[PDB]
Design an enzyme around this catalytic site. Structure first.
Site, PDB file in Angstrom:
ATOM      1  N   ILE A   1      12.299   2.829  11.088  1.00 43.70           N
ATOM      2  CA  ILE A   1      11.682   3.482   9.939  1.00 43.70           C
ATOM      3  C   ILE A   1      10.591   4.410  10.456  1.00 43.70           C
ATOM      4  O   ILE A   1       9.934   4.119  11.459  1.00 43.70           O
ATOM      5  CB  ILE A   1      11.096   2.482   8.910  1.00 43.70           C
ATOM      6  CG1 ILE A   1      11.865   1.155   8.846  1.00 43.70           C
ATOM      7  CG2 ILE A   1      11.090   3.094   7.527  1.00 43.70           C
ATOM      8  CD1 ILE A   1      13.352   1.295   8.561  1.00 43.70           C
ATOM      9  N   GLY A   2      10.417   5.545   9.776  1.00 45.36           N
ATOM     10  CA  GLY A   2       9.398   6.506  10.155  1.00 45.36           C
ATOM     11  C   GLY A   2       9.562   7.011  11.574  1.00 45.36           C
ATOM     12  O   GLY A   2       8.661   6.854  12.403  1.00 45.36           O
TER      13      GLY A   2
ATOM     14  N   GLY B   1       9.944   9.120  15.047  1.00 44.34           N
ATOM     15  CA  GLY B   1       9.095  10.116  15.674  1.00 44.34           C
ATOM     16  C   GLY B   1       9.282  10.086  17.172  1.00 44.34           C
ATOM     17  O   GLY B   1       9.878   9.161  17.729  1.00 44.34           O
ATOM     18  N   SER B   2       8.763  11.131  17.822  1.00 40.95           N
ATOM     19  CA  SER B   2       8.869  11.218  19.274  1.00 40.95           C
ATOM     20  C   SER B   2       8.054  10.125  19.956  1.00 40.95           C
ATOM     21  O   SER B   2       8.528   9.488  20.904  1.00 40.95           O
ATOM     22  CB  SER B   2       8.421  12.599  19.749  1.00 40.95           C
ATOM     23  OG  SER B   2       7.218  12.991  19.112  1.00 40.95           O
TER      24      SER B   2
ATOM     25  N   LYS C   1       6.809   5.189  15.869  1.00 41.22           N
ATOM     26  CA  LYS C   1       7.839   4.692  14.967  1.00 41.22           C
ATOM     27  C   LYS C   1       7.262   3.541  14.154  1.00 41.22           C
ATOM     28  O   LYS C   1       6.199   3.008  14.471  1.00 41.22           O
ATOM     29  CB  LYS C   1       9.098   4.250  15.732  1.00 41.22           C
ATOM     30  CG  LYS C   1       9.392   5.088  16.976  1.00 41.22           C
ATOM     31  CD  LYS C   1      10.580   4.570  17.760  1.00 41.22           C
ATOM     32  CE  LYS C   1      11.324   5.705  18.444  1.00 41.22           C
ATOM     33  NZ  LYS C   1      10.399   6.782  18.892  1.00 41.22           N
ATOM     34  N   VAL C   2       7.962   3.179  13.078  1.00 43.65           N
ATOM     35  CA  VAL C   2       7.505   2.133  12.163  1.00 43.65           C
ATOM     36  C   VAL C   2       8.575   1.045  12.120  1.00 43.65           C
ATOM     37  O   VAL C   2       8.886   0.503  11.053  1.00 43.65           O
ATOM     38  CB  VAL C   2       7.199   2.693  10.758  1.00 43.65           C
ATOM     39  CG1 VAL C   2       6.279   1.755   9.970  1.00 43.65           C
ATOM     40  CG2 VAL C   2       6.593   4.086  10.845  1.00 43.65           C
TER      41      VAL C   2
ATOM     42  N   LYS D   1       4.275  -0.141  15.698  1.00 40.35           N
ATOM     43  CA  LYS D   1       3.982   1.268  15.933  1.00 40.35           C
ATOM     44  C   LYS D   1       3.851   1.492  17.430  1.00 40.35           C
ATOM     45  O   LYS D   1       3.002   0.877  18.081  1.00 40.35           O
ATOM     46  CB  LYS D   1       2.717   1.715  15.198  1.00 40.35           C
ATOM     47  CG  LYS D   1       2.948   2.079  13.736  1.00 40.35           C
ATOM     48  CD  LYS D   1       2.081   3.260  13.326  1.00 40.35           C
ATOM     49  CE  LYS D   1       2.620   3.954  12.086  1.00 40.35           C
ATOM     50  NZ  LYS D   1       2.156   5.371  12.007  1.00 40.35           N
TER      51      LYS D   1
ATOM     52  N   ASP E   1      -6.832  12.435   7.400  1.00 39.29           N
ATOM     53  CA  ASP E   1      -5.368  12.450   7.353  1.00 39.29           C
ATOM     54  C   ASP E   1      -4.933  11.591   6.164  1.00 39.29           C
ATOM     55  O   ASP E   1      -4.743  10.381   6.290  1.00 39.29           O
ATOM     56  CB  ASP E   1      -4.755  11.957   8.655  1.00 39.29           C
ATOM     57  CG  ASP E   1      -3.240  11.988   8.630  1.00 39.29           C
ATOM     58  OD1 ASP E   1      -2.670  13.092   8.496  1.00 39.29           O
ATOM     59  OD2 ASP E   1      -2.616  10.911   8.743  1.00 39.29           O
TER      60      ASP E   1
END
Ligand SMILES: Nc1nc2c(ncn2[C@@H]2O[C@H](COP(=O)(O)OP(=O)(O)OP(=O)(O)O)[C@@H](O)[C@H]2O)c(=O)[nH]1
Ligand SMILES: Nc1nc2c(ncn2[C@@H]2O[C@H](COP(=O)(O)OP(=O)(O)O)[C@@H](O)[C@H]2O)c(=O)[nH]1
Ligand SMILES: [Mg+2]
EC number: 2.7.11.1
Lengths: 432, 267, 94, 426
Positions: B16-17, B19-20, B23-24, B39, B133
């Site tokens: 989930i989520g 990314g390079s 991640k989740v 993460k 953010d």
């Protein structure tokens, strides 16, 4: 019989010398003037014809003022005016000055004093050399005297205590240079080196000892405690006496990997020691904690390679062995595939001596730890990063160029450190 | 890479989520008796920005502050070869994915989630700390979509007072401010204060107000006056609130004290 | 921007301008002050008696010291650490 | 051992020089007569640096007092520490320069230099090991801007290895006391850039900003602004004169300061500046020093460093203190205002420590700064020179000394190049 020679270089070296020799004279009961009022001291202190003890130390610095302080201090009659050597001009944070212009005029007299004191020595066990990489004197002069000392005595062990520059805090702009250009000497001419930064000691002083304003003397006293814990086996008797050559041979598996890590336990104040029971399991579990490392490196990111434990005081081998097993059977502390046996326990008798005006509480037992491990490579990699960011713009190069270093040595030294990190990775590569 | 985690039974799966370098991935645990989101941080592959000069800032905020509707990490641990994972609490869905499930959320439950996240935003700014953010992808909700929990505390700073203003310009253009993008020093509190404006706007309107396609024209558009999609019904105190969260003047927007207590959110 | 036009610039007793900074000065605090004589009963405030006390004060001279920063007042400093300090080696290692 | 030769030129130079010898005298506790009247042994251990031994327990300055107009040397000998300067070091011209850089550098400079070159060589051979030379003068004078810049050319040939630093007075925008100010300045910095290892550009207008705001002085006489410059001078070499936790000198700072040989211009500063009232709500802590340090109002020159990027920073602390609260706070000031330091140099800040504080004050520090903002000064003087050169005004005074016009072109050539390369490093 075993003999030490201390070769302290630069302001950091001479201040460490003040701390360590104050600790040694208090430990053996030597007065500041230099007499025992009432032969373990023959490792360091040699008699004179007048029944007074003198130390096996040479302090050299290219600025006169700091050593002149010692010449005018309370130990003015403990050291010789001969073993205190000063320079009219200093390196001023320049490896080129420290290595080619000012060091030439005086390396001969430094070697002369070393030769005389080694002639005084009968069985010379080895050399402990204390300097800093940031300082021009402590880098360049130490490197050139290293080069000459190896060819004068190839076989003697040449152990290095040096002040590594801390990752965030530094006391110069051009220190990564001299740090890089001293790595050639410290790689091809050192059997084992003990780089420390001041930032980790600052955190330790804030973190354990509750002192909210330490000066340089407190870090110096901790380093003096380290060196006394190292040499306790030579100085005093014990069940498992471990001299220099044992732990150097069992800490260096490869000629180009000789960079272990210092650690001390227990470090705690009197107020805190009054309420806390201290045991071998206590102090060894304290030793195996990332928060107690004298350098800013996390060994949970690195692979333990060889650990040398020096226990001192009312220690019992049962407690040692149970300690070692309760270190081994834990997943967070990992050991390299080719090193199934990885521990070096030596035992001494004499408990630590607390100096008046000190910080350390008096304890019955203590342990020092010297761990060769691979996590240190990240520090050299960060130093590489800052060196490249400086060399790309070619800052500060003209000082070295005009002093008499050829600029290609900069690229050579960068390549050398890159090779060192590459072979650290090669050793970390698994043996399946 | 995962051997130390495999000894702890941390076989994650369920990316989930993506990314390079983050991640989740949902995980499984034995000590905590359930599931945890993991993460990852790649300390070597990722650029220095994250790796140095900002790494302790993010992790310290992930260490100290505690509150019901914020991150609550269990521990940080890592495999030897120079990596970084994060063991964070149970998670369900961030707000943007849930927005797309129905297109938007009606105001009654919307002011419920907003009072929760506005309530959370009070707590961040009292403790002399800033986020910088806030985004629908980082607004992580509950499984029943009745609770809020902001995440990705990646731009922390020990903000104290007005006389010193931040110089770092860090922010995605979808939830940004000209004082970030027009190159002028800004109050760190006021930039975050506007981050609620787009977060509230996107969640109910179904689209962000302006167009994050042109860096230069966006501030020039941003002084035209914010406009809502036609056919959408909100409250007048919220028509005000979005207008006092997306206005060009820095300090004319309400701070944390007044954004705390609003008539519509109290209603 | 050197904000100095035609202005007041007279004696500090009137208490105008940077008069307060003028009072905080060595010469002002070594200036003597007469003790009140006949009359003066009328010139009195509520704060003069109700919320404050007034007594006669003795004025004294000063010691001469090496001023560093042009507004140095080394006279009105506590009578310790005014002498030459010692090196950290001489205070720790004795 | 590390001796230092005290050079002077210009009416500005002599009064600052006289006030400086006032400041370092009580530091070593030396009376107007010539006898030591201090207390501590350390306070007379390092006297050989600035002073020279004389018979009868007397000490004399290693002084060189030079000025073409003989009027000012009457004022210096009549000062409080007047009769300590040796009369042989009063080498003087017979006429003035009339604010003309030309006469002081070429015509009337050429005769007095030999006597100046006589005394400085004797002073050089007096000491065993000289650390280097230093000179204070005015770039806006006739002698200091002129003959002094002629002097600094000759010593670089004679003593190349020795360091030179010039505590040099720069012209101000608003406080302009002379109309031929630009021509001398543009003809003297051109000599500085080739022969100077480190420059300190001190501005008298910025000194007036300190008194009016930081100290609330209502009548700043020249003896006050001359004190602040003298305070900067002693703070540079305090780590040289006294032992410290981490010792340093002129050499350690100079190497730690010059990244490229053309960039040696600095902004000095002084830490413990408080008004008369300010002693009541204050507590002497290293946080209060450093906050005062980097705040731009404290600066001794006429340029806001906020508009530039700091290249290198040195802080010479003075007194008894712990290390890390300095060390955390220079880390703190580095991290927070990250925009204003350059990114291709990590750890731009240098720290030095001396144990001995200034007398009658617990803790002090001195700040030497290299930033991009000094270029904002050089474009201003270039702006004002060109608007006057373009009409060839006032020129016949300078061409009356035989000098050509290409040097005017060549002098401005360096300044535009200097600001060109300085802008590249922003
Ligand atoms: N831990 C510790 N470090 C010190 C001490 N004194 C100096 N250092 C280190 O020494 C470094 C600078 O080297 P110095 O010893 O001051 O100077 P140097 O080595 O003689 O070289 P030069 O400056 O050229 O004369 C600093 O960065 C300090 O980190 C000390 O007492 N304790
Ligand atoms: N800060 C300061 N500046 C001074 C002092 N005396 C003179 N000046 C400056 O020196 C400049 C004139 O220098 P000048 O006397 O012509 O130097 P000379 O021709 O070489 O002797 C003026 O612009 C003054 O601002 C002083 O005591 N303090
Ligand atoms: Mg040194």
């Amino acid at each position: 019989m075993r003999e030490c020679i201390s070769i302290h270089v630069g302001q950091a070296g001479v201040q460490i010398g003040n701390a360590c020799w104050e600790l040694y004279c208090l430990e053996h009961g030597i007065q500041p003037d230099g007499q025992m009022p009432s032969d373990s001291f023959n490792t360091f202190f040699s008699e004179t014809g007048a029944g007074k003890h003198v130390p096996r130390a040479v302090f050299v610095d290219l600025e006169p003022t700091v050593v002149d302080e010692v010449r005018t201090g309370t130990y003015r009659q403990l050291f010789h005016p001969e073993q205190l050597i000063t320079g009219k001009e200093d390196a001023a944070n320049n490896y080129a000055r420290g290595h080619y212009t000012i060091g030439k005029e005086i390396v001969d007299l430094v070697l002369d004093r070393i030769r005389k004191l080694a002639d005084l020595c009968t069985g010379l066990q080895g050399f402990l050399i204390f300097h800093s990489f940031g300082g021009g004197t402590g880098s360049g002069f130490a490197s050139l005297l290293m080069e000459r000392l190896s060819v004068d005595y190839g076989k003697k062990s040449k152990l290095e205590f040096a002040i590594y520059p801390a990752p965030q805090v530094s006391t110069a702009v051009v220190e990564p240079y001299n740090s890089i250009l001293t790595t050639h000497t410290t790689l091809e001419h050192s059997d084992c080196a003990f780089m420390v930064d001041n930032e980790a000691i600052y955190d330790i002083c804030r973190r354990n000892l509750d002192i909210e304003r330490p000066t340089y003397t407190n870090l110096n006293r901790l380093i003096g405690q380290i060196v006394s814990s190292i040499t306790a086996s030579l100085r005093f008797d014990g069940a498992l006496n471990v001299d220099l050559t044992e732990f150097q041979t069992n800490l260096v598996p490869y000629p180009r990997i000789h960079f272990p890590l210092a650690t001390y336990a227990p470090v705690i104040s009197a107020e805190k020691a009054y309420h806390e029971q201290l045991s071998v399991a206590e102090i060894t579990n304290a030793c195996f904690e990332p928060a107690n490392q004298m350098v800013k490196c996390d060994p949970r990111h690195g692979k333990y390679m060889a650990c040398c434990m020096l226990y001192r005081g009312d220690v019992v081998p049962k407690d040692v062995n149970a300690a070692i097993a309760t270190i081994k059977t834990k997943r967070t502390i990992q050991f390299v595939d080719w090193c199934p046996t990885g521990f070096k326990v030596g035992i001494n008798y004499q408990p630590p001596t607390v100096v008046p005006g000190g910080d350390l509480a008096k304890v019955q037992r203590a342990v020092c730890m010297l761990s060769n491990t691979t996590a240190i490579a990240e520090a050299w990699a960060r130093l590489d990063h800052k060196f490249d960011l400086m060399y790309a713009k070619r800052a500060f190069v003209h000082w070295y160029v005009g002093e008499g270093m050829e600029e290609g040595e900069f690229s050579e030294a960068r390549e050398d450190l890159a090779a060192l990190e590459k072979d650290y990775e090669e050793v970390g590569v698994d043996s399946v | 890479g995962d051997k130390l985690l495999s000894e702890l039974g941390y076989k994650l799966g369920r990316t989930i989520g993506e990314g390079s370098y983050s991640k989740v991935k949902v995980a499984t645990s034995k000590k905590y008796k359930g599931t945890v989101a993991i993460k990852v941080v790649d300390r070597r592959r990722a650029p220095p920005d994250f790796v140095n000069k900002f790494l302790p800032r993010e992790l310290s905020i992930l260490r100290g502050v505690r509150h019901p509707h914020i991150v609550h990490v269990f521990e940080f641990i890592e495999v030897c070869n120079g990596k970084l994972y994060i063991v964070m609490e149970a998670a369900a869905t961030d707000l943007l994915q849930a927005v797309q499930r129905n297109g938007r959320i009606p105001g009654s439950q919307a002011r419920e989630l907003f009072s929760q996240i506005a309530g959370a935003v009070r707590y961040l700014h009292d403790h002399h700390l800033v986020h910088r953010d806030l985004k629908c992808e980082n607004v992580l909700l509950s499984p029943d979509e009745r609770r809020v929990k902001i995440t990705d505390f990646g731009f922390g700073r020990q903000a104290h007072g007005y006389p010193d203003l931040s110089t770092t310009y860090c922010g995605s253009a979808a939830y940004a401010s000209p004082e970030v993008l027009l190159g002028i020093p800004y109050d760190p509190k006021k930039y975050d204060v506007w981050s609620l404006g787009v977060v509230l706007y996107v969640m109910v309107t179904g689209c962000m107000p302006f167009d994050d396609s042109d860096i230069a024209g966006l501030p020039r558009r941003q002084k035209r006056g914010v406009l809502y999609p036609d056919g959408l019904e909100l409250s007048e105190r919220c028509k005000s609130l979005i207008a006092e969260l997306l206005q060009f003047s820095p300090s004319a927007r309400p701070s944390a004290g007044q954004v705390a207590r609003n008539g519509w959110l109290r209603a | 921007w050197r904000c100095t036009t035609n202005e007041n610039s007279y004696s500090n007793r009137t208490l105008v301008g940077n008069w307060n900074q003028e009072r905080y000065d060595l010469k002002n605090i070594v200036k003597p002050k007469p003790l009140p004589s006949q009359f003066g009963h009328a010139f009195e405030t509520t704060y003069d008696a109700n919320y404050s006390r007034k007594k006669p004060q003795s004025t004294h001279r000063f010691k001469r010291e090496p001023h560093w920063f042009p507004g140095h007042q080394p006279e009105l400093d506590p009578p310790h650490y005014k002498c030459t300090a010692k090196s950290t080696y001489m205070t720790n290692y004795s | 051992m590390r001796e230092i030769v005290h050079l002077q030129a210009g009416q500005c130079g002599n009064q600052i020089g006289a006030k400086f010898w006032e400041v370092i005298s009580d530091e070593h506790g030396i009376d107007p007569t010539g006898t030591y009247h201090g207390d501590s042994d350390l306070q007379l251990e390092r006297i050989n640096v600035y002073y020279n031994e004389a018979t009868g327990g007397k000490y004399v300055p290693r002084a060189v007092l030079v000025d073409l107009e003989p009027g000012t040397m009457d004022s210096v000998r009549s000062g409080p520490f007047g009769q300590i300067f040796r009369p042989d070091n009063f080498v003087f011209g017979q006429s003035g320069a009339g604010n003309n850089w030309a006469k002081g550098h070429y015509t009337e400079g050429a005769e007095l230099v030999d006597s100046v070159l006589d005394v400085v060589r004797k002073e050089a051979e007096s000491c065993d090991c000289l650390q280097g030379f230093q000179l204070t003068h005015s770039l806006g004078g006739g002698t200091g801007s002129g003959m002094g810049t002629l002097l600094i050319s000759k010593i670089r040939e004679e003593y190349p290895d020795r360091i030179m630093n010039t505590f040099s007075v720069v012209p101000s925008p608003k406080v302009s006391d002379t109309v031929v100010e630009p021509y001398n300045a543009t003809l003297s910095v051109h000599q500085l850039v080739e022969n100077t290892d480190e420059t300190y550009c001190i501005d008298n207008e910025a000194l007036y900003d300190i008194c009016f705001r930081t100290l609330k002085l209502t009548t700043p006489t020249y003896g006050d602004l001359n004190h602040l410059v003298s305070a900067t001078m002693s703070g540079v070499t305090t780590c040289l004169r006294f032992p410290g936790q981490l010792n340093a000198d002129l050499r350690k700072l100079a190497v730690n300061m010059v990244p490229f040989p053309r960039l040696h211009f600095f902004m000095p500063g002084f830490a413990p500046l408080t008004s008369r009232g300010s002693q009541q709500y204050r507590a002497l802590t290293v946080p209060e020093l450093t906050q005062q340090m980097f705040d731009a109002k404290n600066m001794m020159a006429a340029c806001d460093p906020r508009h530039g990027r700091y290249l290198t920073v040195a802080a010479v602390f003075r007194g008894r203190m712990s290390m890390k609260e300095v060390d955390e706070q220079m880390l703190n000031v580095q991290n927070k205002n990250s925009s204003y330091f350059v990114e291709w140099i990590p750890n731009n800040v240098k720290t030095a420590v001396c144990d001995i504080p200034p007398r009658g004050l617990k803790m002090s520090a001195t700040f030497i700064g290299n930033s991009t903002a000094i270029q904002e000064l050089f474009k201003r003087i270039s702006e004002q020179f060109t608007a006057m050169f373009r009409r060839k005004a006032f020129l016949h005074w300078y061409t009356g000394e035989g000098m050509d016009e290409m040097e005017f072109t060549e002098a401005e050539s360096n300044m535009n190049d200097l600001v060109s390369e300085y802008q590249q490093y922003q």
